[PDB]
């Protein structure tokens, strides 16, 4: 009802800056409090650096739920959004 099927998803496919910041904050918070790390780490200790490194690889298990003005919403997986 409220959800929109994957085939007719119309919103912009790119990743808005605000989505970028929210995703980075959430991931860093999760990692920084004993969460699994989906990608290898070489020498970087900061959770937030780890977060951007993970994003750059498109390896984030987060689904953005975009609310349209009416109330209907569509969902995008972070794996499928074109990041600048």
């Amino acid at each position: 009802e409220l959800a929109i099927l994957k085939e007719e998803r119309t919103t912009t496919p790119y990743l808005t800056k605000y989505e970028r910041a929210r995703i980075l904050g959430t991931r860093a918070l999760q990692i920084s409090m004993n969460a699994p790390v989906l990608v290898d780490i070489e020498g970087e200790t900061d959770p937030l650096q780890i977060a951007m490194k993970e994003l750059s690889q498109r390896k984030i298990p987060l689904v953005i739920r975009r609310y349209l003005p009416d109330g209907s919403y569509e969902d995008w997986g972070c794996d499928e959004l074109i990041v600048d």
Binding site: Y18, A21, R22, G25
Partner: protein
């Protein structure tokens, strides 16, 4: 954290920062409400749960 600062923070769209800066770094609080009348008259005794 005057009004104009609130508006500037909105401008950048830093929602969560604004939320916490007005709750956590300031007078936060917790309450209880009744889901029927929607008032704040609940008589809560935590140690008596």
């Amino acid at each position: 954290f005057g009004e104009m600062e609130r508006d500037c923070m909105i401008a950048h769209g830093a929602a969560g920062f604004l939320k916490e800066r007005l709750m956590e770094a300031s007078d936060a609080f917790r309450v209880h409400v009744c889901g029927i009348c929607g008032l704040m008259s609940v008589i809560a005794n935590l140690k008596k749960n």
